[PDB]
Paper text:
Herpes simplex virus type-1 expresses a heterodimeric Fc receptor, gE-gI, on the surfaces of virions and infected cells that binds the Fc region of host immunoglobulin G and is implicated in the cell-to-cell spread of virus. gE-gI binds immunoglobulin G at the basic pH of the cell surface and releases it at the acidic pH of lysosomes, consistent with a role in facilitating the degradation of antiviral antibodies. [name]-1 gE-gI is a heterodimer composed of two type I membrane glycoproteins: gE, a 530-residue protein including a ˜401-residue extracellular region followed by a predicted single transmembrane helix and a ˜106-residue C-terminal cytoplasmic tail; and gI, a 370-residue protein including a ˜248-residue extracellular portion followed by a predicted single transmembrane helix, and a ˜94-residue C-terminal cytoplasmic tail. Here we report the structures of CgE, an Fc-binding fragment of the [name]-1 Fc receptor gE-gI, and a gE-gI complex with Fc.
Author numbering:
A (entry chain A), B (entry chain B): 237 to 443
C (entry chain F), D (entry chain E): 220 to 390
Amino acid sequence: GPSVFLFPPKPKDTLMISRTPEVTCVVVDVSHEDPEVKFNWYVDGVEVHNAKTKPREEQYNSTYRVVSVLTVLHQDWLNGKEYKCKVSNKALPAPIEKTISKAKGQPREPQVYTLPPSREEMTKNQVSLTCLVKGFYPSDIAVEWESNGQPENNYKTTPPVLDSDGSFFLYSKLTVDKSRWQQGNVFSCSVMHEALHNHYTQKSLSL
Amino acid sequence: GPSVFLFPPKPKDTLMISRTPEVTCVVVDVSHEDPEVKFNWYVDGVEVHNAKTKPREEQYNSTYRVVSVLTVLHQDWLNGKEYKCKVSNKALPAPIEKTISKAKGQPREPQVYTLPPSREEMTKNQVSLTCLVKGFYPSDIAVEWESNGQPENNYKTTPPVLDSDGSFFLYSKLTVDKSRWQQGNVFSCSVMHEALHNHYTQKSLSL
Amino acid sequence: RGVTVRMETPEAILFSPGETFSTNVSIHAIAHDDQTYSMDVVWLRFDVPTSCAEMRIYESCLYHPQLPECLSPADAPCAASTWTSRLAVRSYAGCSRTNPPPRCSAEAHMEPVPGLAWQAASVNLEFRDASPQHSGLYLCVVYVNDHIHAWGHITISTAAQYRNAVVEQPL
Amino acid sequence: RGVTVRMETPEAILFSPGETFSTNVSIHAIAHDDQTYSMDVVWLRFDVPTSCAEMRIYESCLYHPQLPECLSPADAPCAASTWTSRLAVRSYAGCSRTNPPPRCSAEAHMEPVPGLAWQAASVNLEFRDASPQHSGLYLCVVYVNDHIHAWGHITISTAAQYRNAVVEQPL
Ligand SMILES: *[C@@H]1O[C@H](CO[C@H]2O[C@@H](C)[C@@H](O)[C@@H](O)[C@@H]2O)[C@@H](O[C@@H]2O[C@H](CO)[C@@H](O[C@@H]3O[C@H](CO[C@H]4O[C@H](CO)[C@@H](O)[C@H](O)[C@@H]4O[C@@H]4O[C@H](CO)[C@@H](O[C@@H]5O[C@H](CO)[C@H](O)[C@H](O)[C@H]5O)[C@H](O)[C@H]4NC(C)=O)[C@@H](O)[C@H](O[C@H]4O[C@H](CO)[C@@H](O)[C@H](O)[C@@H]4O)[C@@H]3O)[C@H](O)[C@H]2NC(C)=O)[C@H](O)[C@H]1NC(C)=O
Ligand SMILES: *[C@@H]1O[C@H](CO[C@H]2O[C@@H](C)[C@@H](O)[C@@H](O)[C@@H]2O)[C@@H](O[C@@H]2O[C@H](CO)[C@@H](O[C@@H]3O[C@H](CO[C@H]4O[C@H](CO)[C@@H](O)[C@H](O)[C@@H]4O[C@@H]4O[C@H](CO)[C@@H](O[C@@H]5O[C@H](CO)[C@H](O)[C@H](O)[C@H]5O)[C@H](O)[C@H]4NC(C)=O)[C@@H](O)[C@H](O[C@H]4O[C@H](CO)[C@@H](O)[C@H](O)[C@@H]4O)[C@@H]3O)[C@H](O)[C@H]2NC(C)=O)[C@H](O)[C@H]1NC(C)=O
């Protein structure tokens, strides 16, 4: 029988007004004998009709993958509305329903602190710039780095870790050529979260 | 039919000579009608006989859980020896074999850097003490905190994140009262890893 | 005080007929106070004649497209300095620091253009089975309380139709 | 230079007959140079007579258990100052900063004692179905190149047999 997986929109798509967030209802293990799948979408119980079906895709393991995409409103998602996807197919005894929405709990603003590289690390060829983002809720977030308005791609960010106060925290590490650091270059840690003013905040770091 | 899961020893048990590391072969979904399970252990192909069977445990979901424990030598594990557990039972058409050993790859010494709280944090109730452990391989590690020889339990450590150079890094955050930090108190980050001299190193943090 | 808008996007997208693609504009808005504001993300499209060596964007004119020199641009056929029809507009109302841009979405309009569409809950434009008819100079302008707070241009076209766009600015 | 050994463990373990438990000694070794060394983790057991008010450990004697005053302790029946049989010994050879303690494990010996055993690849002692016969004063001594680098004591016994152990030390 087919299986269903309901995915939430990307954090950046929900936090930026210049983007379009969407919920994705993926149906796997669709058979060749019965590939026709019906979708019924609901938002807080109220059925909606603006969803679109992505083009069918052959998986080569004897099944198809049928997907439905529903566009959501930034404020609807952020306000904790529930999205339900009902999937019906002749090889399914009864319709399958999955529900997903934002994590419930009072949103808390993340505290962002930039931390310079340890003096002990200067003996190495490249150094580590840290950015501590803590006290945030929910875990949906986006953290990036930049310098002179240009994006710095040489970083790794830990997954959110649940703190002892019910909030989340994480650490992001940008690695730069020691020369760049010692020269006074200014680097910034950009964080996007719903509880921040205008969903954004930027914290700089330099020698 | 029964299922098998083979677990490696704890990092601290392999790194401390004062402890005894062991591999655990867990067999779940053992049936009430045929709970007799035979174990055959091998170390690099050579069959060994010093394993012990843990007392049988009723799961209350119609099945038993049968477990076998094999004690290993610190050096044998650290040297990348392979441990295979073969599980035979009447309900099993053919014996099941699982193999586990240390992660293969040249071990690399972790660089440990302690990072003090941000100036911006000096106005909150509690401050954050950071410890950056990077450049290590394999990911098997143990990180703890202490002050005046006494263990500090108020910390959270991110899981190891794979860096762009094939090594791992992580961050540990200890949260303390601004008073303590202000007073000049000495806090430390204890790290245990096979690649460290004596599998140990401490990094102090204060003013 | 007020609102700050910053836009980021490549200046050109070269496409071959039949391809499907979308713009990749990035827009961030920061409300410095708790005042309520309205926002409009507007897309303008300009014809790029074959005989034009390059297109000229009269920057100062974007702020007052009704001035004589802007309504009748000197570089006439090759100038982006005023407009009538708006290709597309996504409007926001009742926006604030606490009810930020995505949440304050209100209306959306788009001219009927074969193969053109909004990529759902996004300010980017999507082109399906792109054809030469889609080539031209596109401008994305962001208004806050009916005043431009940010703008950018993208020349979207096939290689043969492409003409460099130049921003004519004050000293 | 040399090696530093630090030991940590509670000073007492009270048990009731029939219980199974183990010691919880922690030992860390730090090699400050690349010199090769040998190590021996030795467990000593001392009888604690019922008539003793307390046991006295002659610390200085641990380093020279063959001196007259150590072989014939003044507090005679209630003194831990010398030994003959060693309850258990885990030996290490060819150890170094690069071939650290666990990896340099070589031999292990333990006296035949009902219910006593090594908890596999560990320096701790395990007591199964503990009985009054197991009560006594235990010392864990760590040697590096045949010289004591660390030591600790644990009074392991039932409540009725327990006697406080006191370390007699120099000024
Ligand atoms: C036949 O083949 C099928 C296709 O598989 C192909 O790949 C390999 C498997 C090959 O071996 C070969 O077979 C095929 O070429 C195969 O389907 C798979 O079936 C799995 C089990 O049935 C199923 O597992 C679940 O996976 C969930 C996670 O899925 C995501 O992550 C995986 C891996 O990273 C990825 O492959 C999926 O595509 C999913 O990826 C996410 O997709 C969403 C939706 O598009 C993205 O979100 C949107 O992104 C857009 C982008 O523009 C927008 O941003 C929009 O706003 C977003 O909404 C999202 O970004 C993307 N994430 C990632 C990381 O890529 C698990 O959640 C799930 O586990 C949960 O549930 C189970 C059961 O309840 C529990 O056990 C778990 O504990 C957990 O609770 C589960 O693991 C695979 O996902 C599925 N693969 C695909 C590609 O669909 C089929 O089984 C085969 N059948 C046979 C008989 O062989
Ligand atoms: C009948 O009931 C059984 C029991 O159910 C009840 O227990 C709960 C846990 C729930 O299961 C709940 O429903 C019930 O109340 C049930 O058994 C379960 O069956 C699962 C599927 O068959 C099986 O899943 C696998 O789990 C692996 C991880 O297991 C560990 O972690 C979980 C929690 O994170 C824990 O519950 C387990 O006990 C395991 O814990 C580890 O245990 C080892 C050995 O004791 C520890 O290592 C030793 O520790 C000692 C000290 O104790 C020494 O230090 C020694 O040196 C060490 O070696 C270890 O510390 C400990 N770790 C943790 C974190 O606790 C997954 O790895 C595994 O995933 C793989 O395979 C799946 C496919 O199966 C893939 O999808 C994955 O991608 C991956 O490849 C898998 O998920 C459960 O483990 C099992 N639970 C138990 C307790 O046995 C049974 O299925 C039920 N059957 C029916 C028909 O209903």
